[PDB]
Amino acid sequence: PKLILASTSPWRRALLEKLQISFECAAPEVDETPRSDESPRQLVLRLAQEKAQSLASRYPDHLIIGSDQVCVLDGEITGKPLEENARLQLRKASGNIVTFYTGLALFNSANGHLQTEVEPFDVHFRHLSEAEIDNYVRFKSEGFGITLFERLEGRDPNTLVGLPLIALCQMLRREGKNPLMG
Amino acid sequence: PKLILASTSPWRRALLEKLQISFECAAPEVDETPRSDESPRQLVLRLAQEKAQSLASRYPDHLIIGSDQVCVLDGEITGKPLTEENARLQLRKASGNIVTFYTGLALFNSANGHLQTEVEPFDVHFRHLSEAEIDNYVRKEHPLHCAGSFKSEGFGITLFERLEGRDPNTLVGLPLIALCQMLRREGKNPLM
């Protein structure tokens, strides 16, 4: 089965290219609005698998990857900021440990096999100033955002960038598609 | 530039660009040969310091960065394999094991002579690899000029169970979180 990435993120596309398996990107049709009861972990698991499953008709004999990421700023779920948004997020982060939750799903639309995983990554922020927050504004963990951090703690730095590649390699291995054998 | 990178590494240049502070590069003048009984941490501390200070006379009013990394497998410094045989040998030693990289960093301020040094570890936890996986990785990646015989930033992700360290940049070869701290201590915060 051919590989499909259910995302138009150029970040997720670039990450997946590291595995050297040919794939096609497709835009999933999913409402990402958190439900009131919903934990960060529940949300990204649900959205990861909905994104993958939503493409099953358009790509019916495929391995389909879905992923979703949020962070929590003082218990509160937060997605992409979309400029005054970006500033706010920094102010809450200062001096704190910020946990990102990244959900991942691999769906075999041929036989219906589904694998899911949620992987956290903790960003330990320096105590910042409004000056340096103002100066930074206007994060990018792979870039200039490194100036904001005390420590990054998690299984896989790729997860923080937005796709858990170690976890995905394992899911692919279960489906008989070890990137190392492709 | 007030900031100088004492390195001919193109990846250290690329990493330093992330801080968006003006700098230029110059080749350090040191002997990287390990001395008898020198430990990995001692070696990268020494070489980081030496690279930074070797430019003092050329850049006497500057903040000068030096860095050095070694790859350690079962207590021993591990070099570039050079051959496909040796690449497979290194990956066999890596399989189901932890490869530790030690990365030394120094910032020498030549104007006031302040020297700051640090060594930072980064642990790469490998999966248990088959001989086929090892053969296939070496054939695809040809990591013949990488110490440890894998590239962590790329296809090497297919070999790992987890990555453990303070800063992903350290593994690539420049401890940027640590360097930011050193730069702030000298009043050159990249955020300003």
Numbering used by the authors:
A (entry chain B): 2 to 83, 85 to 140, 151 to 194
B (entry chain A): 2 to 193
The authors write:
Maf (for multicopy associated filamentation) proteins represent a large family of conserved proteins implicated in cell division arrest but whose biochemical activity remains unknown. Here, we show that the prokaryotic and eukaryotic Maf proteins exhibit nucleotide pyrophosphatase activity against 5-methyl-UTP, pseudo-UTP, 5-methyl-CTP, and 7-methyl-GTP, which represent the most abundant modified bases in all organisms, as well as against canonical nucleotides dTTP, UTP, and CTP. The protomer structures of the four Maf proteins revealed a large β sheet containing seven β strands (β1 to β7) with two α-helical subdomains on one side and one long α helix on another side. Thus, pyrophosphatase activity of Maf proteins toward canonical and modified nucleotides might provide the molecular mechanism for a dual role of these proteins in cell division arrest and house cleaning.
Screening of Maf proteins for pyrophosphatase activity against a set of 57 noncanonical or modified nucleoside triphosphates revealed that the YhdE-like Maf proteins (E. coli YhdE, BSU28050, YOR111W, and ASMTL-Maf) also exhibited high pyrophosphatase activity against 5-methyl-UTP (m5UTP or riboTTP), pseudouridine triphosphate (pseudo-UTP or Ψ), and 5-methyl-CTP (m5CTP), whereas the two YceF proteins (from E. coli and S. typhimurium) were active toward 7-methyl-GTP (m7GTP). The Michaelis-Menten constant, KM, of the YhdE-like proteins toward canonical pyrimidine nucleotides varied in a micromolar range: 32.7–53.0 μM for dTTP; 29.7–72.4 μM for UTP; and it was lower (to a lesser extent for ASMTL-Maf) with modified nucleotides (4.7–47.2 μM). Both YceF proteins also showed high affinity to m7GTP (32.8 μM for YceF and 30.9 μM for STM1189). Hydrolysis of m7GTP by the E. coli YceF was inhibited in a dose-dependent manner by unmodified nucleotides, with 50% reduction at 80–100 μM (GTP, ATP, UTP), which is higher than its KM to m7GTP (32.8 μM). The two structures of YceF-like Maf proteins (Tb-Maf1 and YceF) appear to display an open conformation of the active site, which can accommodate a nucleoside group of the substrate without any conformational change in the binding pocket. The Tb-Maf1 contains a phenylalanine residue at this site (Phe16) whose side chain points away from the pocket, whereas the Glu170 side chain is oriented toward the pocket and can participate in base recognition. This Glu residue is conserved in YceF (Glu154) and other YceF-like Maf proteins, making it the signature residue-3 of the YceF subfamily motif. In the YceF structure, the Glu154 side chain is partly disordered, suggesting local structural flexibility. It should be noted that the YceF E154A mutant protein retained the wild-type level of substrate affinity and catalytic activity. The Tb-Maf1 Gln86 (Gln70 in YceF) resides at the bottom of the pocket, providing the side chain-main chain H-bonds to the C end of the α6 helix and thus determining the size of the guanine recognition site.
